[PDB]
Design a protein around this nucleic acid. Structure first.
Lengths: 97, 167, 115
RNA sequence: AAAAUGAAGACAUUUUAACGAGUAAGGAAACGAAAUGGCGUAAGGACAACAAAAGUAGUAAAGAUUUAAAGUAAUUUAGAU
RNA sequence: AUAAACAUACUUUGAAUCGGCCAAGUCUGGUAAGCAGGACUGGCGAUGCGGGAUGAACCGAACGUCGAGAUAAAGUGCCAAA
RNA sequence: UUCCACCUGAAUAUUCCCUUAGGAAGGUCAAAGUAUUAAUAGUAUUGAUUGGUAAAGAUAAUGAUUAGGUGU
RNA sequence: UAUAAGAAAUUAUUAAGAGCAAGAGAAUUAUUUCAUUUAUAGUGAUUAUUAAUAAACGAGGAUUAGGAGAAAUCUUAGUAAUUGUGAAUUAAAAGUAAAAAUCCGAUAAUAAUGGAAUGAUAAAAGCUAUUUAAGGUAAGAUUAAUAAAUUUAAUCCCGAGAAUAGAAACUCUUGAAGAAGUAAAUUAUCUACCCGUCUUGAAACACGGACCAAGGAGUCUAACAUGGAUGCGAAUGAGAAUAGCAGGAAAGCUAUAACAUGAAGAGAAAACGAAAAACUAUGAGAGUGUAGAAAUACAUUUAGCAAUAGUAUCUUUCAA
């Protein structure tokens, strides 16, 4: 009955499916990543409580990179972080009256 | 419940031939069929006027037909009522279709060279109505209408049903 | 505002308009409340107003087009189910936690349970 | 209420839609698409096995007591005594 | 602006009725009255149903015969469904 | 003050009566019958108005009423 | 009469046999809905990686005698100014900034799995497969320029319409040893004040009613009016008395007829007694053409009845 009333249902259902299928895969291909960054910060923890933990000076860079990006994108990460810091300061000042 | 302004009551329109007249029943059958199929407003009009009560179908005399047919020489006057005769004035040549013709009215129309038709012949000849003139008689000429209302009224008094010591 | 105690109202979303029209929609054809079943009947009733399909009908209602009055007047009033009217009761304004009055966009939660 | 069909089917046709509370009170009969529909009491005029012996009845009428069936209801129908 | 064609305008003939009663973000006489009398609206009378234990008027809501669900007033220790 | 079902469904204003336990005109209601119909509105908006209630005033007019200065 | 349909009966085999009704399922479904699970373009908080400054806060601070913990290797214990925690802020590493869990906001929708009430059985504007390609507006994917973007370009993918081919006929239980339904009696849960009447209000401590049968109350004659069916129609009636006919008849048929109502109205009465062969407005109906395109919607020509309202004109009256 929906097709009889709205023939556009077939166009926005197949195309809706392809949105769903890929969007589900993005969850998977963000969990594999967040498995590395979660299994690269374990071997920066059980390697830091273990020996060093006074001898509180522990190495600053026990966390290791897992996804590689070009130098230009590295500059954009610090550009983005500056913007979101400004946005947080922009909002906090506003609601603080 | 539901807030309706008024509830459903029968619509006060007649849709069949009043009484047990076998021929008037067939005429309503014929024109209810003609109006439904041809979808002509003429058959719708004739069918509606066939279903009125006798008081609401007033007569039309030959004098009135003559005056209304003056500038309609080759036409067929159609009045759904009895056609009486006006002996005061002459009857010219014309074709009339009516439910019933007075004995004198039929002779006067015929003797002048005209024709007296019935409604079945009219439907056979002019079903949708092409050379016809629709005519109805006067309703306010009834004497009963004189006594309706208040006779003490300042504007349009009634006419005082006569009775004991009426001066 | 004058009839505030007897009605609750608000601003619908597009999805709310679609569900009401598709599920509870109807038209007044020849004085008969005929439910919407095809685009042919919508074309017959509202073809003169350049509304020939149900999605034209939804778009006109939502955006309030030029022919909103003719389109809206052809649509029979929807008959809804029952749902939890209010927190305390329907004898106080929704602002006080009651049932009637202007709910603004929060009317879509109520319509979800009533459609 | 509106469409469709309509000499005879029949269940007072077919379809779609809206509706159905109620004291006093009103809606007489007839009216094919019927301007409400029906039950009962008694009497009068007809009709009742269509092929020249034409409704039922001493092979058990009316009535009475009950058992069941049809009808929303008024009531009707049938069995047994 | 919104609504309105089973809309609108009626015409004719006629029935019953003019003892009323209650509520109140109302008023007058009275110390006051389940007193007497009024303005506006809604009800009871003419009215059943769910709730207030019970009740003409209170609250929800007005009724063809049924099935399934979401509800309203209002409730969830037992009588009593939660 | 005697059968069933179905549909619609009220009243306590106004005028007159030797009227006050009752009548007639009229309002409410029902049933019949019409008219293609200058013949829709117990609603809101915009525009021009009407009114003298709630409030307000009290050497602002008519009244009521407690005092304190200055001058003759 | 020509073609399928091709019935009953017959032949061989067994996965070997009714009708109806009730119940339970099967496969695909229509309307409504119950329970559970699952994603909902929060840029919200936590979810061990290191360091520093802190606004505040209490304590502590410098040989094992008795012990706690752990198989640690490290902490705990108590008998004259070093140090501990820390809201918040900052640096480096990591991070394209969508995992999972909880909280906080937003929502409740698509789907799936099980049912319930009323149904249906049929094949598709079903669903599936092959062809070309309208489309994918953050978001179908991969890339590049850049970027607090629902900003751009490329080529890969899928793909609506349409054309062409595909698929649904089932199982079990109970019943003339009595099924389903219905009825009567009893039991059990819920439920139920005395009918009629006057009355604002009665189950009322208001009146009538002990019970049963039969009788029992809007009728008949006469005058007027409205209204629905009927006949005739400037006439209608003349079943006014009464007079005739066949038949023998309280019935039926026939009588150019007095009269009743109406066709003429106003005035107390005398005396009188109606056209400008009318006018204006809106209004019923009938055609032609075009178009949508199914019905229907516009343009234009024509007729203008009924009804209502208003005009002239005429009869009568002191006065219309």
């Amino acid at each position: 009955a929906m097709v009889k009333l709205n023939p556009y249902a077939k166009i926005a259902s197949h195309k809706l499916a392809q949105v769903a299928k890929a969007q589900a895969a993005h969850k998977a291909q963000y969990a594999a990543k967040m498995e590395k960054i979660l299994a690269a910060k374990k071997e920066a923890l059980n390697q830091s409580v273990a020996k060093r933990f006074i001898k509180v000076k522990v190495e600053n860079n026990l966390l290791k990179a897992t996804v590689k990006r070009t130098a230009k994108q590295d500059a954009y990460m610090k550009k983005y972080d500056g913007i979101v810091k400004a946005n947080a300061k922009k909002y906090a000042e506003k609601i603080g009256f | 419940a539901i807030d309706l302004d008024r509830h459903h009551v029968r619509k006060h329109v007649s849709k069949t031939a009043r009484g047990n007249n076998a021929y008037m029943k067939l005429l309503v059958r014929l024109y209810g069929f003609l109006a439904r199929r041809t979808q002509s407003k003429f058959a719708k009009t004739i069918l509606h006027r066939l279903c009125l009560s006798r008081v609401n179908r007033p007569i039309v005399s030959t004098s009135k037909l003559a005056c209304l047919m003056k500038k309609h020489p080759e036409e067929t006057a159609v009045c759904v009522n009895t056609v009486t005769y006006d002996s005061r004035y002459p009857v010219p040549k014309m074709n009339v279709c009516a439910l019933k013709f007075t004995k004198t009215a039929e002779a006067a129309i015929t003797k002048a060279g005209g024709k007296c038709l019935r409604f079945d012949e009219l439907a056979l000849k002019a079903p949708t109505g092409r050379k016809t003139v629709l005519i109805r008689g006067k309703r306010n000429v009834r004497e009963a209408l004189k006594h309706f209302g208040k006779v003490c009224a300042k504007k349009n008094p009634a006419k005082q049903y006569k009775g004991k010591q009426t001066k | 505002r004058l009839v505030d105690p007897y009605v609750t109202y608000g601003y619908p979303t597009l999805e709310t308009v679609q569900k009401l029209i598709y599920k509870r929609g109807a038209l007044k054809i020849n004085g008969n409340r005929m439910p919407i079943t095809s685009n042919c009947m919508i074309k017959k009733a509202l073809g003169d107003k350049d509304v020939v399909c149900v999605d034209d009908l939804v778009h006109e209602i939502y955006t309030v087009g030029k022919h909103f009055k003719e389109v809206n007047n052809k649509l029979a009033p929807f008959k809804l189910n029952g749902a939890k009217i209010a927190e305390k009761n329907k004898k106080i304004h929704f602002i006080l936690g009651g049932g009637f009055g202007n709910r603004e966009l929060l009317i879509n939660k109520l319509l979800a349970n009533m459609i």
